[PDB]
Symmetry: C3
Subunit: 114 residues, 3 copies
């Protein structure tokens, strides 16, 4: 799986341990091994949410399976919680796009997961 | 909805008011409340379009519904128009990927927009 | 088509000509004219793959058609080979998301690639 978070919060406000916490908690939540979890954090972005430049985040989580109604609500509670606690971003200023990827549509190690 | 624009145009060339104009015009175009419109502009990128590095933009618009044949052509006219007028990017050097998101696949405020079944 | 590469490799490590090489190789692989191939490389990113910050890349390839089981295996061998050769990134630290776009969902030049119906 891969998780990306784009935010206008400054890089200095990202705490030590963040990428590792995201990796471990997403491994727990998705049921996938941590060695297959990739994370990308993009601070200092020029963005607005509702026309306001208060802290916000636009994110995405891609996974082959383990994407659905209840699961996505669980991922959103987990991720909004981390973004609130660690980056001080209000949950109502976060959007997370979820993608259930077909294994044939994910390349890795010179081939695909199909 | 969320609209992202990635471009090689310098940050200095983005005019004051641009994020607000995109927010307001997308609210008008999609019929969605402006309070729910998010925008992200990424300048100074290393990109090429057709192998040339003249000004260009690669964008995306994600919305739960309001994505379709005629609507997407209307959004493209609006957005290419704004990118040409404000960032001086030629419309034929702009790609915009449209995504019709299912409500269950959009997280917000500790949950998603699928609040009907559990 | 559009190909995006996000990596933690430093900008100085992206060779001159890399965008052009990707453009040419992708035009060849997809059969699409190079004039329609867009590439975006984003170095110096804060990323981890499997909990490690050694070189890695998260990428995407969007194309209207020319996306499928065998074609994607071929694109992966091609692209991982280029990322390994040019950016020194191990293929097992590379993910590439493939998207088969509908023509009506790709905006370009004030409209979309759905020009047949109203």
């Amino acid at each position: 799986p891969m998780f990306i978070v784009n935010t206008n919060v400054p890089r200095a406000s990202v705490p030590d341990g963040f990428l590792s916490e995201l990796t471990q908690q997403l491994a727990q939540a998705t049921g996938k091994p941590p060695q297959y979890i990739a994370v990308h954090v993009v601070p200092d972005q020029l963005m607005a949410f509702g026309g306001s430049s208060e802290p916000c985040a636009l994110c995405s989580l891609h996974s082959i399976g383990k994407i659905g109604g209840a699961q996505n609500r669980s991922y959103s509670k987990l991720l909004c919680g981390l973004l609130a606690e660690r980056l001080r971003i209000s949950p109502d200023r976060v959007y997370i796009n979820y993608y259930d990827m077909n294994a044939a549509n994910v390349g890795w190690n010179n081939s695909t997961f199909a």
